[PDB]
Amino acid sequence: MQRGIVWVVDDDSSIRWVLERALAGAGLTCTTFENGNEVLAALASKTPDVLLSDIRMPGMDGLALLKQIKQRHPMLPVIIMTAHSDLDAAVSAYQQGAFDYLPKPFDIDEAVALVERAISHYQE
Ligand code: BEF
């Protein structure tokens, strides 16, 4: 049941290949973007069930990426790979409905782990 669209924003390629096929086997649609602002463009026409954002490119490292998401999507939850920058912006995330902040590690094991158990807690 349910579609299941998981969007990721990071270095792509490596992160994409793993999360794309592997997460696809789980029954979801995993796509990746450059870092964050890219998903925003796509977000302007769609909303993923579990968004994943990077944090090492934009102004506020990555938390800034959250701000963009909350500006147009004050509900779409996002998952950041790092929280070493201005954590302040991460707060605007929790208020808009962000997912959380995961350490640099991720891959399928660490990401799929946080995604499945997370969506399961939400349910329809
Ligand atoms: F690689 Be991301 F900037 F955490």
PDB file of C-alpha atoms and ligand atoms in Angstrom:
ATOM      1  CA  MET A   1       0.000   0.000   0.000  1.00  0.00           C
ATOM      2  CA  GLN A   2       0.955   3.664  -0.394  1.00  0.00           C
ATOM      3  CA  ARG A   3       3.437   4.956  -2.967  1.00  0.00           C
ATOM      4  CA  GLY A   4       6.494   5.922  -0.955  1.00  0.00           C
ATOM      5  CA  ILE A   5       8.773   8.618  -2.342  1.00  0.00           C
ATOM      6  CA  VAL A   6      12.155   9.151  -0.689  1.00  0.00           C
ATOM      7  CA  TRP A   7      14.191  12.123  -1.929  1.00  0.00           C
ATOM      8  CA  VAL A   8      17.867  12.668  -1.075  1.00  0.00           C
ATOM      9  CA  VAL A   9      20.149  15.690  -1.340  1.00  0.00           C
ATOM     10  CA  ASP A  10      23.939  15.194  -1.083  1.00  0.00           C
ATOM     11  CA  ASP A  11      27.024  14.310  -3.152  1.00  0.00           C
ATOM     12  CA  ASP A  12      24.718  12.181  -5.321  1.00  0.00           C
ATOM     13  CA  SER A  13      26.372   9.404  -7.387  1.00  0.00           C
ATOM     14  CA  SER A  14      27.678   7.324  -4.473  1.00  0.00           C
ATOM     15  CA  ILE A  15      24.811   8.278  -2.168  1.00  0.00           C
ATOM     16  CA  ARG A  16      22.402   8.031  -5.090  1.00  0.00           C
ATOM     17  CA  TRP A  17      23.427   4.590  -6.388  1.00  0.00           C
ATOM     18  CA  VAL A  18      23.065   3.012  -2.955  1.00  0.00           C
ATOM     19  CA  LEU A  19      19.872   4.731  -1.863  1.00  0.00           C
ATOM     20  CA  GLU A  20      18.360   4.605  -5.373  1.00  0.00           C
ATOM     21  CA  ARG A  21      18.353   0.850  -6.026  1.00  0.00           C
ATOM     22  CA  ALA A  22      18.509  -0.445  -2.454  1.00  0.00           C
ATOM     23  CA  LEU A  23      15.735   1.817  -1.224  1.00  0.00           C
ATOM     24  CA  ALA A  24      13.881   0.944  -4.415  1.00  0.00           C
ATOM     25  CA  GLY A  25      13.882  -2.674  -3.323  1.00  0.00           C
ATOM     26  CA  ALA A  26      12.117  -1.559  -0.160  1.00  0.00           C
ATOM     27  CA  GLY A  27       9.225  -0.312  -2.279  1.00  0.00           C
ATOM     28  CA  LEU A  28       9.967   3.410  -2.479  1.00  0.00           C
ATOM     29  CA  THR A  29      11.236   5.941  -5.016  1.00  0.00           C
ATOM     30  CA  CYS A  30      14.703   7.192  -4.110  1.00  0.00           C
ATOM     31  CA  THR A  31      16.083  10.070  -6.136  1.00  0.00           C
ATOM     32  CA  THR A  32      18.995  12.393  -5.389  1.00  0.00           C
ATOM     33  CA  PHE A  33      19.874  16.037  -5.984  1.00  0.00           C
ATOM     34  CA  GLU A  34      23.019  18.226  -5.932  1.00  0.00           C
ATOM     35  CA  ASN A  35      22.818  19.429  -2.310  1.00  0.00           C
ATOM     36  CA  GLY A  36      19.506  21.000  -1.369  1.00  0.00           C
ATOM     37  CA  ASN A  37      18.366  23.959  -3.441  1.00  0.00           C
ATOM     38  CA  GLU A  38      17.874  21.466  -6.249  1.00  0.00           C
ATOM     39  CA  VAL A  39      15.165  19.524  -4.379  1.00  0.00           C
ATOM     40  CA  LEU A  40      13.409  22.828  -3.727  1.00  0.00           C
ATOM     41  CA  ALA A  41      12.833  23.317  -7.446  1.00  0.00           C
ATOM     42  CA  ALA A  42      11.406  19.823  -7.692  1.00  0.00           C
ATOM     43  CA  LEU A  43       9.579  20.329  -4.396  1.00  0.00           C
ATOM     44  CA  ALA A  44       7.764  23.302  -5.910  1.00  0.00           C
ATOM     45  CA  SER A  45       5.782  20.739  -7.903  1.00  0.00           C
ATOM     46  CA  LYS A  46       5.914  17.736  -5.557  1.00  0.00           C
ATOM     47  CA  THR A  47       6.371  16.627  -1.965  1.00  0.00           C
ATOM     48  CA  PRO A  48       8.358  13.484  -0.984  1.00  0.00           C
ATOM     49  CA  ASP A  49       7.302  11.301   1.946  1.00  0.00           C
ATOM     50  CA  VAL A  50      10.802  11.332   3.441  1.00  0.00           C
ATOM     51  CA  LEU A  51      13.193  14.051   2.298  1.00  0.00           C
ATOM     52  CA  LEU A  52      16.929  13.789   2.936  1.00  0.00           C
ATOM     53  CA  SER A  53      19.124  16.910   2.784  1.00  0.00           C
ATOM     54  CA  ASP A  54      22.877  17.464   2.752  1.00  0.00           C
ATOM     55  CA  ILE A  55      24.743  20.051   4.769  1.00  0.00           C
ATOM     56  CA  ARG A  56      27.935  21.447   3.256  1.00  0.00           C
ATOM     57  CA  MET A  57      27.315  23.782   0.308  1.00  0.00           C
ATOM     58  CA  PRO A  58      24.681  26.567   0.758  1.00  0.00           C
ATOM     59  CA  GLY A  59      24.948  29.558   3.069  1.00  0.00           C
ATOM     60  CA  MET A  60      24.125  27.938   6.407  1.00  0.00           C
ATOM     61  CA  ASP A  61      26.076  24.799   5.488  1.00  0.00           C
ATOM     62  CA  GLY A  62      22.890  22.753   5.184  1.00  0.00           C
ATOM     63  CA  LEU A  63      20.404  23.810   7.816  1.00  0.00           C
ATOM     64  CA  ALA A  64      19.759  26.698   5.446  1.00  0.00           C
ATOM     65  CA  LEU A  65      18.413  24.098   3.034  1.00  0.00           C
ATOM     66  CA  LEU A  66      15.832  23.271   5.665  1.00  0.00           C
ATOM     67  CA  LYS A  67      14.708  26.890   5.866  1.00  0.00           C
ATOM     68  CA  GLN A  68      13.950  26.808   2.130  1.00  0.00           C
ATOM     69  CA  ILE A  69      11.913  23.637   2.600  1.00  0.00           C
ATOM     70  CA  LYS A  70       9.956  25.096   5.505  1.00  0.00           C
ATOM     71  CA  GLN A  71       9.326  28.325   3.612  1.00  0.00           C
ATOM     72  CA  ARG A  72       7.331  26.596   0.890  1.00  0.00           C
ATOM     73  CA  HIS A  73       6.777  23.293   2.662  1.00  0.00           C
ATOM     74  CA  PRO A  74       6.257  23.932   6.404  1.00  0.00           C
ATOM     75  CA  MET A  75       5.429  20.242   6.848  1.00  0.00           C
ATOM     76  CA  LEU A  76       7.682  18.182   4.582  1.00  0.00           C
ATOM     77  CA  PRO A  77      10.123  16.438   6.963  1.00  0.00           C
ATOM     78  CA  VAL A  78      13.810  16.462   6.022  1.00  0.00           C
ATOM     79  CA  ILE A  79      16.871  14.532   7.198  1.00  0.00           C
ATOM     80  CA  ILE A  80      20.273  16.204   7.396  1.00  0.00           C
ATOM     81  CA  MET A  81      23.558  14.249   7.304  1.00  0.00           C
ATOM     82  CA  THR A  82      25.415  16.720   9.511  1.00  0.00           C
ATOM     83  CA  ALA A  83      24.635  19.180  12.308  1.00  0.00           C
ATOM     84  CA  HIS A  84      28.056  20.772  12.886  1.00  0.00           C
ATOM     85  CA  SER A  85      26.984  24.168  11.534  1.00  0.00           C
ATOM     86  CA  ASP A  86      24.503  26.718  12.890  1.00  0.00           C
ATOM     87  CA  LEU A  87      22.116  24.300  14.607  1.00  0.00           C
ATOM     88  CA  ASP A  88      19.845  27.333  15.033  1.00  0.00           C
ATOM     89  CA  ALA A  89      18.418  26.803  11.548  1.00  0.00           C
ATOM     90  CA  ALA A  90      17.688  23.170  12.434  1.00  0.00           C
ATOM     91  CA  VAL A  91      15.115  24.488  14.894  1.00  0.00           C
ATOM     92  CA  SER A  92      13.050  26.068  12.122  1.00  0.00           C
ATOM     93  CA  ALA A  93      13.055  22.507  10.809  1.00  0.00           C
ATOM     94  CA  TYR A  94      11.530  20.785  13.826  1.00  0.00           C
ATOM     95  CA  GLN A  95       8.859  23.477  13.877  1.00  0.00           C
ATOM     96  CA  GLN A  96       8.032  23.008  10.190  1.00  0.00           C
ATOM     97  CA  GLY A  97       8.000  19.240  10.645  1.00  0.00           C
ATOM     98  CA  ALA A  98      11.547  18.133   9.814  1.00  0.00           C
ATOM     99  CA  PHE A  99      12.698  14.542  10.347  1.00  0.00           C
ATOM    100  CA  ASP A 100      15.894  15.052  12.368  1.00  0.00           C
ATOM    101  CA  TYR A 101      19.681  15.300  12.095  1.00  0.00           C
ATOM    102  CA  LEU A 102      21.808  12.208  11.399  1.00  0.00           C
ATOM    103  CA  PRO A 103      25.645  12.165  11.606  1.00  0.00           C
ATOM    104  CA  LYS A 104      27.730  12.079   8.402  1.00  0.00           C
ATOM    105  CA  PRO A 105      27.249   8.274   8.163  1.00  0.00           C
ATOM    106  CA  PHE A 106      24.134   7.168   6.295  1.00  0.00           C
ATOM    107  CA  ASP A 107      24.191   4.684   3.403  1.00  0.00           C
ATOM    108  CA  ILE A 108      21.310   2.242   3.270  1.00  0.00           C
ATOM    109  CA  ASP A 109      21.914   0.727   6.668  1.00  0.00           C
ATOM    110  CA  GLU A 110      21.929   4.034   8.561  1.00  0.00           C
ATOM    111  CA  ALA A 111      19.518   5.880   6.268  1.00  0.00           C
ATOM    112  CA  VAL A 112      17.011   3.155   5.466  1.00  0.00           C
ATOM    113  CA  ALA A 113      17.102   2.413   9.170  1.00  0.00           C
ATOM    114  CA  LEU A 114      15.983   5.913  10.039  1.00  0.00           C
ATOM    115  CA  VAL A 115      13.528   6.109   7.128  1.00  0.00           C
ATOM    116  CA  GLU A 116      11.519   2.889   7.524  1.00  0.00           C
ATOM    117  CA  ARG A 117      11.158   2.981  11.315  1.00  0.00           C
ATOM    118  CA  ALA A 118      10.319   6.655  10.907  1.00  0.00           C
ATOM    119  CA  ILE A 119       7.554   6.289   8.318  1.00  0.00           C
ATOM    120  CA  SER A 120       6.192   3.399  10.358  1.00  0.00           C
ATOM    121  CA  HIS A 121       5.738   5.732  13.324  1.00  0.00           C
ATOM    122  CA  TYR A 122       3.858   8.193  11.131  1.00  0.00           C
ATOM    123  CA  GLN A 123       1.541   5.793   9.302  1.00  0.00           C
ATOM    124  CA  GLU A 124      -1.490   6.936   7.311  1.00  0.00           C
TER     125      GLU A 124
HETATM  126  F1  BEF B   1      27.858  15.760   2.866  1.00  0.00           F
HETATM  127 BE1  BEF B   1      26.822  16.639   3.464  1.00  0.00          BE
HETATM  128  F2  BEF B   1      27.241  18.059   3.344  1.00  0.00           F
HETATM  129  F3  BEF B   1      26.649  16.295   4.899  1.00  0.00           F
END
